[PDB]
Amino acid sequence: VVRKAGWLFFKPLVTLQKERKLELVARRKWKQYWVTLKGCTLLFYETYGKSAPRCALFAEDSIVQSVPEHPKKEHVFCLSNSCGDVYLFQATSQTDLENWVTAIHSACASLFAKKHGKEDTVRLLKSQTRSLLQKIDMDSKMKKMAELQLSVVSDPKNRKAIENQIRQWEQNLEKFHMDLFRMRCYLASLQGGELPNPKSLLAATSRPSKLALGRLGVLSVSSFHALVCSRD
């Protein structure tokens, strides 16, 4: 069944190319489509209806963020999927944007709960946030321990070996923070609350990550999400 439907301007922004590196989509432009949300799939139709979609967007495990700062358009929101892709959408109003964000996050939370074989979605989400928080605490401590051990190592290759480990700990932490943010987005959308502060998530981006996002040309929660996905 359809959870929501309505006109939307669409524009692909980022994609994961071979070698698994992110890149801005070339020749990207705004096109309007009558869009429908069925399950966690966004179907795009070139004409209003109530007849085959021109394309589909499988949004399982996605994150949606409003983009009020967009310089030329209002009511823009951004969807980053679980594959390293980032998309832009323009709703018809602020209310319409909120309805879309709520709809997509609710569908995703639903599928998420379904995959974990649970019917109490809110409880699963809360349980997840607690778990992610403990993992962050645990891995943060492991990372400091590794760094302390590296401090006395002079051996060249032995040095890099521990650094490689430190980087993994660092990447695992970004992923946990990303999952934590995503879980809070789902919870907020299901309970009518304010979505989690994106600035708080960007504070967890490592220097290497920030540089990569900087070379990409887009530094935000959405591109950060795409970066974390590219490592999967």
Curated annotation (Swiss-Prot):
The entry's comment on post-translational modification says: Phosphorylated on serine and threonine residues. Its phosphorylation by Rho-kinase inhibits its guanine nucleotide exchange activity, its interaction with MAP1A, MAP1B, PARP1 and YWHAE and reduces its ability to promote neurite growth.
Give tissue specificity per the record.
Expressed in fetal brain (at protein level). Expressed in the olfactory bulb, cortical plate of the cerebral cortex, caudate putamen, hippocampus, ependymal cells of the lateral surface of the lateral ventricles of the brain. Weakly expressed in heart, lung, liver, skeletal muscle, kidney and testis.
Question: Where does the signal peptide begin and end?
Answer: none
Its quaternary organisation is: Interacts with MAP1A, MAP1B, PARP1 and YWHAE. Interacts with CD44, PARD3 and MAPK8IP2.
UniProt remark on domains = The PH 1 domain and amino acids 619-780 (a region called TSS; otherwise known as CC-Ex) are necessary for membrane localization. PH 1 and TSS domains are necessary for Rac1 activity. The PH 2 domain is engaged in the enhancement of the catalytic activity of the adjacent DH domain. The PH 1, TSS and DH domains are necessary to induce neurite-like structure.
Q: What does this protein do?
A: Modulates the activity of RHO-like proteins and connects extracellular signals to cytoskeletal activities. Acts as a GDP-dissociation stimulator protein that stimulates the GDP-GTP exchange activity of RHO-like GTPases and activates them. Activates specifically RAC1, but not CDC42 and RHOA. Mediates extracellular laminin signals to activate Rac1, contributing to neurite growth. Involved in lamellipodial formation and advancement of the growth cone of embryonic hippocampal neurons. Promotes migration of neurons in the cerebral cortex.
Name this protein carries in UniProt: Rho guanine nucleotide exchange factor TIAM2
Instruction: Please name the gene that encodes this protein.
Output: Tiam2
Q: Which region of the full protein is contained in this chain?
A: 504 to 741 of 1715
